[PDB]
CSV table of C-alpha atoms and ligand atoms in Angstrom, one decimal:
chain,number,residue,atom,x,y,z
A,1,UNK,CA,61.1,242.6,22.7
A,2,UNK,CA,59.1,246.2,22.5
A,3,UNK,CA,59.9,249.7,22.4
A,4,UNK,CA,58.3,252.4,25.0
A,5,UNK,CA,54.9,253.0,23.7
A,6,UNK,CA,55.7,256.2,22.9
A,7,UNK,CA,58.6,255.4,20.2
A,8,UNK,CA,56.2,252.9,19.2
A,9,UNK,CA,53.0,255.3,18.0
A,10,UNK,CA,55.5,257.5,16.8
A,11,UNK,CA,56.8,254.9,14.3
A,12,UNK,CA,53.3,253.9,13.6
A,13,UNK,CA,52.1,256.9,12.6
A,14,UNK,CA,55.1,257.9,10.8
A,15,UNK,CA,55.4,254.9,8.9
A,16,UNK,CA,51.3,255.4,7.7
A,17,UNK,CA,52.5,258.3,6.6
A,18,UNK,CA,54.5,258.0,4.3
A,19,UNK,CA,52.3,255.1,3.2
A,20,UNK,CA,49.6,257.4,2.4
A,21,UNK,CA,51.7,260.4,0.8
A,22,UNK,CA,51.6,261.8,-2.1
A,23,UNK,CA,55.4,261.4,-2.5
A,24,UNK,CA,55.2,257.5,-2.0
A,25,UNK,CA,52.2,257.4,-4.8
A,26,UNK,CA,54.4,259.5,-7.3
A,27,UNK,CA,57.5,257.0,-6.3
A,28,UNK,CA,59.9,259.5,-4.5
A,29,UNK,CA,60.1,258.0,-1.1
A,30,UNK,CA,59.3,254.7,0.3
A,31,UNK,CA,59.5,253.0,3.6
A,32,UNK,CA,59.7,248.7,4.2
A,33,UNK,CA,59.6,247.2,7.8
A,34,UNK,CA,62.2,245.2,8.4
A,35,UNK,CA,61.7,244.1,11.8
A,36,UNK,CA,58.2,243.8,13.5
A,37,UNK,CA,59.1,245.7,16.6
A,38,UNK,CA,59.8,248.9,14.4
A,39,UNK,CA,63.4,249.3,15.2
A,40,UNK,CA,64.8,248.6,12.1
A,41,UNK,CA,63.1,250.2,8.7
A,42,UNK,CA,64.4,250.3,5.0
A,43,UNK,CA,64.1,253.5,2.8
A,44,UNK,CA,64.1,254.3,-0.9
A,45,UNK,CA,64.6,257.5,-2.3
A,46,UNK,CA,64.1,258.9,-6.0
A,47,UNK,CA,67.1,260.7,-7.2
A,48,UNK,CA,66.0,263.7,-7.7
A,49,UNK,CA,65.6,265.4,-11.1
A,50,UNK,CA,68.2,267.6,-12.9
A,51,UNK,CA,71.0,266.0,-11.0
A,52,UNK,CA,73.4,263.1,-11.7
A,53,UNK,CA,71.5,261.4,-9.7
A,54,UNK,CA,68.3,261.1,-11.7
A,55,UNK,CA,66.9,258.0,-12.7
A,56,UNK,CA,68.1,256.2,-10.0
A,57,UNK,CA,66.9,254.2,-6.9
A,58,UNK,CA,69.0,254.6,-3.1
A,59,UNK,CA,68.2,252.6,-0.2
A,60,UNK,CA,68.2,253.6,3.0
A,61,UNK,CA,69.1,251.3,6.2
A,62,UNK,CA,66.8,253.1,9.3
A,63,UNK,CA,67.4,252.4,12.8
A,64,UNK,CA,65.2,253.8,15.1
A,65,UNK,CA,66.6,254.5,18.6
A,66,UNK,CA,64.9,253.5,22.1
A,67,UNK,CA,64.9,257.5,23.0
A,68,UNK,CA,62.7,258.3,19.5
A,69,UNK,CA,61.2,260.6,19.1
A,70,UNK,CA,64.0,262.7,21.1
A,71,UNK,CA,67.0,261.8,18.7
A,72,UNK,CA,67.2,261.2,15.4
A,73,UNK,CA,67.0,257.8,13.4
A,74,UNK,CA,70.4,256.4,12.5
A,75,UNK,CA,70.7,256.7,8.3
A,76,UNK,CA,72.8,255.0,5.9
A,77,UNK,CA,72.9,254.8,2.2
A,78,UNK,CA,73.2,251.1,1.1
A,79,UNK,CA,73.3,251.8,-1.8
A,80,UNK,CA,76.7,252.8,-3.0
A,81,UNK,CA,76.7,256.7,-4.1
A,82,UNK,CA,79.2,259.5,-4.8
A,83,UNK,CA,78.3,262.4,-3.2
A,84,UNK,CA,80.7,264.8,-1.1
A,85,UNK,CA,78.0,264.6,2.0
A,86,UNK,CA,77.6,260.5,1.8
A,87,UNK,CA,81.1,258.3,2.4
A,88,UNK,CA,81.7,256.6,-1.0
A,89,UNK,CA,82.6,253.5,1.3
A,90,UNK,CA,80.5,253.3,4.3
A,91,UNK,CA,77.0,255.1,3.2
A,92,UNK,CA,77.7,257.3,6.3
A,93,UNK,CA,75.8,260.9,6.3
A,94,UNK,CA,76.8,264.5,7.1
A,95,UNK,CA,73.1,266.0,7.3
A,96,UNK,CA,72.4,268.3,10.4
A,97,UNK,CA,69.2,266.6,10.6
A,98,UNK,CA,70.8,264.1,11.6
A,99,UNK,CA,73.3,265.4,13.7
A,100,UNK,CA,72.7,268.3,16.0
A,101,UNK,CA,69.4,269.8,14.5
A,102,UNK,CA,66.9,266.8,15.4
A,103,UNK,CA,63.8,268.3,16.4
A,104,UNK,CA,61.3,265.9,17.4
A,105,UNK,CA,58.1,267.2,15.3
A,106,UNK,CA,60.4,265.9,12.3
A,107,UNK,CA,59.2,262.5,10.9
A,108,UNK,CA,60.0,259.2,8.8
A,109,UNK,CA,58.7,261.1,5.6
A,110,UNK,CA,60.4,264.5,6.6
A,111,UNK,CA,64.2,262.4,6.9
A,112,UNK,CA,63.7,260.8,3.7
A,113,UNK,CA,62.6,264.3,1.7
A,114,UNK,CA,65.4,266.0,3.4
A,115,UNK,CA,67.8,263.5,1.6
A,116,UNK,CA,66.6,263.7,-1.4
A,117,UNK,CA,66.8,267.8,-1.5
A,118,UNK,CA,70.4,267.1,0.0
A,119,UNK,CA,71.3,265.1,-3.3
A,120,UNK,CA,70.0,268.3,-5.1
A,121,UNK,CA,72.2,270.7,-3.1
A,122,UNK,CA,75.6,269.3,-1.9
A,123,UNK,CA,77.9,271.2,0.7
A,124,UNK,CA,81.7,270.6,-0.2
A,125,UNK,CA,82.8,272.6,2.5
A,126,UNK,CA,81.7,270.8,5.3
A,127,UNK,CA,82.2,267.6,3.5
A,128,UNK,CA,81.6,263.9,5.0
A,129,UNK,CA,83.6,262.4,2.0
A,130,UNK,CA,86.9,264.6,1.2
A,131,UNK,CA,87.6,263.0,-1.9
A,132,UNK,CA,84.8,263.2,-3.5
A,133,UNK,CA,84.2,267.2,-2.2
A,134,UNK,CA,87.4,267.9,-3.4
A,135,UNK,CA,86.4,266.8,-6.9
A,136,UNK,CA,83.4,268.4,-6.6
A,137,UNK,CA,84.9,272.1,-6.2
A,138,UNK,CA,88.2,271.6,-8.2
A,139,UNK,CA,86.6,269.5,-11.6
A,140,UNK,CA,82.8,270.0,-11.7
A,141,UNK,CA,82.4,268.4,-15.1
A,142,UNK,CA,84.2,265.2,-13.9
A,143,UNK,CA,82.5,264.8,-10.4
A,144,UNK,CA,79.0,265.3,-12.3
A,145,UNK,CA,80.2,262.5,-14.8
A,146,UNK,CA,81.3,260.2,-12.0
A,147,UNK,CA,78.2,260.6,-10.0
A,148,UNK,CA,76.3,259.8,-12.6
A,149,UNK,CA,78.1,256.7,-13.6
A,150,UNK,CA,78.0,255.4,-10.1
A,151,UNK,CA,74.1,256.4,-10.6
A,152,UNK,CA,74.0,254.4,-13.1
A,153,UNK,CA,76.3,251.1,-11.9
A,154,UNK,CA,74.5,250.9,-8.3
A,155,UNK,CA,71.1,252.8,-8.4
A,156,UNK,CA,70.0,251.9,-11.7
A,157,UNK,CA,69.7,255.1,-13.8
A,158,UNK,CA,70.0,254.9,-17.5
A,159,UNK,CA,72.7,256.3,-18.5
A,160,UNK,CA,77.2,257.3,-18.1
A,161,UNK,CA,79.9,258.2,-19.7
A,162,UNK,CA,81.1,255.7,-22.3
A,163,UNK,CA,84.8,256.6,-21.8
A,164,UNK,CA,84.6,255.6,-17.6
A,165,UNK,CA,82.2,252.6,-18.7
A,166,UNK,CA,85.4,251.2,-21.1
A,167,UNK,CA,87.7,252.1,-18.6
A,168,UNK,CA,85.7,250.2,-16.1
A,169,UNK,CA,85.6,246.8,-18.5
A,170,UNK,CA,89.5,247.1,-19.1
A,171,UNK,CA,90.3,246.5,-15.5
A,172,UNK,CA,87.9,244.2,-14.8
A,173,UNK,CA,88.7,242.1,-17.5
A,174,UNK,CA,92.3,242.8,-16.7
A,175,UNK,CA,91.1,240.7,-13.3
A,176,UNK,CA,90.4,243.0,-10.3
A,177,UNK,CA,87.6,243.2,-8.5
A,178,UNK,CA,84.8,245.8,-10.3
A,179,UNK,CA,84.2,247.8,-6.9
A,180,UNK,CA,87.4,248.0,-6.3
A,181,UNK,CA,88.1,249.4,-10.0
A,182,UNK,CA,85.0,252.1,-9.7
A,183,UNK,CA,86.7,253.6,-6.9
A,184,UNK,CA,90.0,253.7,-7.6
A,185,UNK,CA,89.4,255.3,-11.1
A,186,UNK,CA,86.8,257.8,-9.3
A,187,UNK,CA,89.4,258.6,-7.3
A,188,UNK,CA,92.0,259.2,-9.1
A,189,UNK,CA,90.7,261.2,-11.8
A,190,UNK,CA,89.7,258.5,-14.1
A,191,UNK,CA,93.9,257.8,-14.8
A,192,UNK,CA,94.1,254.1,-15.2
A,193,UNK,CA,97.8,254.5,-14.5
A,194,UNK,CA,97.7,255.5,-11.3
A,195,UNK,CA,94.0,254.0,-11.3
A,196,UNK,CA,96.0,250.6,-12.1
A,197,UNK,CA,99.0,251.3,-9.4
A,198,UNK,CA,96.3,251.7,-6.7
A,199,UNK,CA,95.0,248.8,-7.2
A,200,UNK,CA,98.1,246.5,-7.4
A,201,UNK,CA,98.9,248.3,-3.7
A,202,UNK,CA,96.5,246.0,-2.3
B,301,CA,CA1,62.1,247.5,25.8
């Protein structure tokens, strides 16, 4: 039925926040109610500029717990991103935020800024994704390429590498599943041998 009153005003307040920013009127951060009690919110974030992940569009699956404002909201990307601090498959976060540095002055708009500057500055070496941070130290050029392509497949941005795009179209028309192909050749350094191999495993 209803939160405690003071979760409630909280999640009022914060969500006329971010209603009223300056960030939401330049289009870096938005926030949709989902449910009318407030414990379930969607988020949008602007990729942030300079960065693979420029030009595109994530959303962001909020729930709020019953102890707000003493823990932090529970954050997932939905949309699907490649980043060594996001899981490639579940949206799951590493941000300390939160984790273990929740403080409870922090708000709705502070969590979704926070992300954003985290897509601006990754941290490999205390990765949520080991793949992916792997890549990221050992073949800069190639994670750069790959996060922009999934930028471009899942958050809209304009442009990717032609080379993974026809890679992508050969396996798919080849009959697998495009998902499936995107992260097998993202994971496997764009080799459609063993690209191909991993996919037949399944
Ligand atoms: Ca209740």
């Amino acid at each position: 039925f209803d939160m405690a009153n003071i979760a409630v005003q909280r999640i009022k307040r914060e969500f006329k926040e971010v209603l009223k920013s300056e960030e939401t009127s330049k289009n870096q951060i938005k926030v949709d109610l989902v449910d009318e009690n407030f414990t379930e919110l969607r988020g949008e974030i602007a990729g942030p500029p300079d960065t693979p992940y420029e030009g595109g569009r994530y959303q962001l699956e909020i729930k709020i717990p019953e102890t707000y404002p003493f823990n932090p909201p529970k954050v997932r990307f939905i949309t699907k991103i490649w980043h060594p601090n996001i899981s490639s498959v579940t949206g799951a976060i590493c941000l300390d935020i939160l984790k273990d540095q929740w403080a409870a002055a922090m708000t709705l708009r502070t969590v979704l800024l926070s992300l954003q500057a985290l897509l601006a500055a990754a941290e490999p070496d205390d990765p949520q994704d080991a793949v992916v941070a792997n890549q990221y130290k050992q073949n800069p050029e190639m994670f750069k390429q790959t996060a922009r392509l999934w930028a471009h497949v899942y958050a809209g941005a304009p442009v990717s590498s032609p080379e993974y795009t026809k890679k992508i179209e050969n396996l798919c028309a080849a009959g697998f599943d495009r998902n499936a192909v995107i992260v097998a050749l993202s994971s496997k350094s764009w080799d459609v041998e063993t690209a191909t191999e991993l996919l037949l495993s399944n």
